[PDB]
Amino acid sequence: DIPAPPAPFDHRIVTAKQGAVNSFYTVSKTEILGQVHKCEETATGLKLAAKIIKTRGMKDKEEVKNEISVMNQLDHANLIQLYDAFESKNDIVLVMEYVDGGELFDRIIDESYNLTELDTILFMKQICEGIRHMHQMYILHLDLKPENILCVNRDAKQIKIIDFGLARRYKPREKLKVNFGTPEFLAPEVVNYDFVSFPTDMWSVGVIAYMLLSGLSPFLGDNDAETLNNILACRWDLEDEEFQDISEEAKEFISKLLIKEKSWRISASEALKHPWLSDHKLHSRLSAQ
Ligand SMILES: Cc1nc(N)sc1-c1ccnc(Nc2cccc(-n3oo3)c2)n1
């Protein structure tokens, strides 16, 4: 398929201004995107999105300023682009690229019965492209889940990663602070309070692939503790009836990502090179159907 259209502006090195977003942007009070408001640069008319991030402490503010700093290093059509930013006493506002007619990926997944395997393959190439770019820029996402991915267009199969709240430049000995409420997306290293790295994102890629193919969450149990049990036992399978009709390649792909031990997971770059995502004679057969 066709690569996503770029932001209508060139990639910027954004630094947060002291002052009110209101002084340079008209923020919509009725159009809410996810808090995220539609907005418009007053001077130019340019249509953008405004994420008001509430910040209690200095540490909260510092987390957002890291987020800005990270977006600054990420220039790619599958990664939402920062346009401007504003800091007040109680919040930092980010102004970002706006995608007209976006649908969040948890929606796409709720409607997984719509998707052929080829549709998912194509969405997956794009998701991997975004992650491959982040990793080759030495950056970890660390929060890759359907609610953080926007389906730009269903037909063209185009996506944009739209939040970098936990993203950071790679360092050794990176331990995350985590909470076990609704933990189905957590990598086992995050659950075990171990260090995170590039494979931490690849686990999530595995999870998303499983979910697009079946509409089911691979590690969900009847409650949070039972879900944690599944993650720590790395307990999952492709025995559900949704998986009966999928290719062997698909099955091998997920098997190379849902691995408890980090170092064994394939990279983003390898994921793209994998027969599920790269094999033309397979995609052809898939189209014929
Ligand atoms: C940053 C962000 N966070 C969301 N939850 S949506 C979002 C975002 C950022 C930029 N552009 C858009 N586009 C957009 C436009 C119109 C609707 C919607 N959606 O899903 O509800 C999204 N959405």
Answer whether 49 contacts ligand 1 (Cβ < 6 A): yes
Q: Which residues, listed in sequence order, are joined to residue 157 by a DSSP beta bridge? A: none
Breaks in the chain, named by the residue before each, with C–N above 2.5 Å?
34
The domain defined by 102-289 folds into Transferase(Phosphotransferase); domain 1 (1.10.510)
Q: Known binding site for ATP: residues?
A: 33-36, 51
Gap from CA of 49 to ligand 1 centroid (Å): 7
- The pairing of beta strand 47-54 with beta strand 91-97: antiparallel
Sign of torsion over alpha carbons 183, 189, 190, 191: positive
Q: Which of 94, 99, 147, 148 to mutate to test the pocket of ligand 1 (most atoms within 8 A of CB)?
A: 99
User: Catalytic site residues?
Assistant: 143
Answer whether 53 contacts ligand 1 (Cβ < 6 A): no
- CB neighbour list of residue 52: distance below 8 Å, 6 or more residues apart: 35, 36, 37, 91, 93
Gap from CA of 111 to ligand 1 centroid (Å): 18
Method used to determine the 3D structure: X-ray
The domain defined by 16-98 folds into Phosphorylase Kinase; domain 1 (3.30.200)
Q: What's the order of all strands across the beta sheet hosting 36-41?
A: 17-18, 82-87, 91-97, 47-54, 36-41, 25-32
- CB neighbour list of residue 226: distance below 8 Å, 6 or more residues apart: none
Amino acid at 42: T
| Packed helices 117-136 and 198-214: angle between N→C axes, nearest 10 degrees | 170
Answer whether 149 contacts ligand 1 (Cβ < 6 A): no
Domain ranges of the chain: 16-98, 102-289
- How many CA atoms within 13 Å lie on the side-chain side of 164? 28
Count Cβ neighbours within 10 Å for each residue of 110-139 and write b for 16 or more, e otherwise: eebeebebbbbbbbbbbbbbbbbbbbeeeb
What gap in Å lies between CA 236 and CA 195, rounded to an integer? 23
Q: Is the Cβ–Cβ distance between 106 and 117 less than 8 Å?
A: no
Gap from CA of 116 to ligand 1 centroid (Å): 25
- CB neighbour list of residue 156: distance below 8 Å, 6 or more residues apart: 1, 2, 4
Task: Look at ligand 1, atom 14, and give the residue with the nearest C-alpha.
Answer: 102
